[PDB]
Ligand binder design. Structure first.
Ligand SMILES: COc1ccc(Cn2c(=O)n3ncnc3c3c4c(sc32)CN(C(=O)[C@@H]2CC2(F)F)CC4)cc1
Ligand SMILES: [Mg+2]
Ligand SMILES: [Zn+2]
Length: 323
């Protein structure tokens, strides 16, 4: 196969994890930072699945094997790594906990799994890089290159022995949840977000948005995926700052490769233009993050703490640009 497999040690150790009780109250908050609890991230995902979907939603042995093999199939890149996957999944947990009955049992188990899996086997390169330099992945996946690969890696991992946590769903539900996951992972291609958000904005603003319309439903799930994927801008400012360092470590490394290939990168991927990052952060908050959390909060009012935190980090960036 293409997917690596966890060891017996790794998935057996997971089964006996118990989350410290203090972290039970903290994990429910949107601003929660998994940062200082690395050893607990797999157990934190197990806990989140059990609160959202119930303690016997998956077979524990299959769930731990799945989680530890997902971990192993994230690479040690600066930003698109195992930490990012658990961070995105936790944001989804918080969204779902606060909007619990708006989503089906199938969607909640799908979206938590999709979030943990959404960057599987990321190489540290953008879709743009892969298609520009004719990476083999881009020959295989013409559009949303990495995201098609991530979903393909999710299916590979499910196909590993004893890994298929969804095999006890009905044949129909099995096929529905894999579709829920496929769309959710594809939706994390930020190139698709801008059109998705303008559509949602117009549906909401005209009163036509209807969560029981499946096409509207897919779009709302997609915006949730974006909101989760971007959620470093919803943490406390020192956490947001530290995560920015990882993001730009990965960007700059891409820009270093572009330079080697004789093609100057955009300033935000050029480490000799670090001075421009604060202004680029302001533009990203204004053009992307703020509209995303604003439209999400209009559709799902309980998600407002994300927008509040995002505005707060916008102001910090504005202070950087000033003093
Ligand atoms: C490293 O790979 C990625 C890809 C996507 C994300 C999603 N994302 C994100 O979560 N956060 N959080 C704070 N800021 C960003 C942010 C910004 C993006 S994407 C993005 C684009 N952008 C650039 O500077 C890029 C280089 C360029 F100009 F193309 C402005 C900032 C994160 C990391
Ligand atoms: Mg991605
Ligand atoms: Zn991501």
């Amino acid at each position: 196969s293409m997917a690596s497999i966890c060891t017996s040690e790794e998935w057996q150790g997971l089964m006996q994890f118990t989350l410290p009780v203090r972290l039970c109250k903290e994990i429910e908050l949107f601003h929660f930072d998994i940062g200082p609890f690395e050893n607990m991230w797999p157990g934190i995902f197990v806990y989140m699945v059990h609160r959202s979907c119930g303690t016997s939603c998956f077979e524990l042995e299959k769930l731990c094997r799945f989680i530890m093999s997902v971990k192993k199939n994230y690479r040690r890149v600066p930003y698109h790594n195992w930490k990012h996957a658990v961070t995105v999944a936790h944001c989804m947990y918080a969204i779902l906990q606060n909007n619990h009955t708006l989503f089906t049992d199938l969607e909640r188990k799908g979206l938590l799994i999709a979030c943990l899996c959404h960057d599987l086997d990321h190489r540290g390169f953008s879709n743009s890089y892969l298609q520009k330099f004719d990476h083999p992945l881009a020959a295989l996946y013409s559009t949303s290159t990495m995201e098609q690969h991530h979903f393909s890696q999710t299916v590979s991992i499910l196909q590993l022995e004893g890994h298929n946590i969804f095999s006890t769903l009905s044949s129909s539900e099995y096929e529905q949840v894999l579709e829920i996951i496929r769309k959710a992972i594809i939706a994390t291609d930020l190139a698709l977000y801008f059109g998705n958000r303008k559509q949602l904005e117009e549906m909401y603003q005209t009163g036509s948005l209807n969560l029981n319309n499946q096409s509207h439903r897919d779009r709302v799930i997609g915006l949730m995926m974006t909101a989760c994927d971007l959620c470093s801008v919803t943490k406390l400012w020192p956490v947001t700052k530290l995560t920015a360092n990882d993001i730009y470590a990965e960007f700059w490394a891409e820009g270093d490769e572009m330079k080697k290939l004789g093609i100057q990168p955009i300033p935000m991927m050029d480490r000799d233009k670090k001075d421009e990052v604060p202004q680029g952060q302001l533009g990203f908050y204004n053009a992307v993050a703020i509209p995303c959390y604003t439209t999400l909060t209009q559709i799902l009012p309980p998600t407002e703490p994300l927008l509040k935190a995002c505005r707060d980090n916008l102001s910090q960036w504005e202070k950087v640009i000033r003093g």
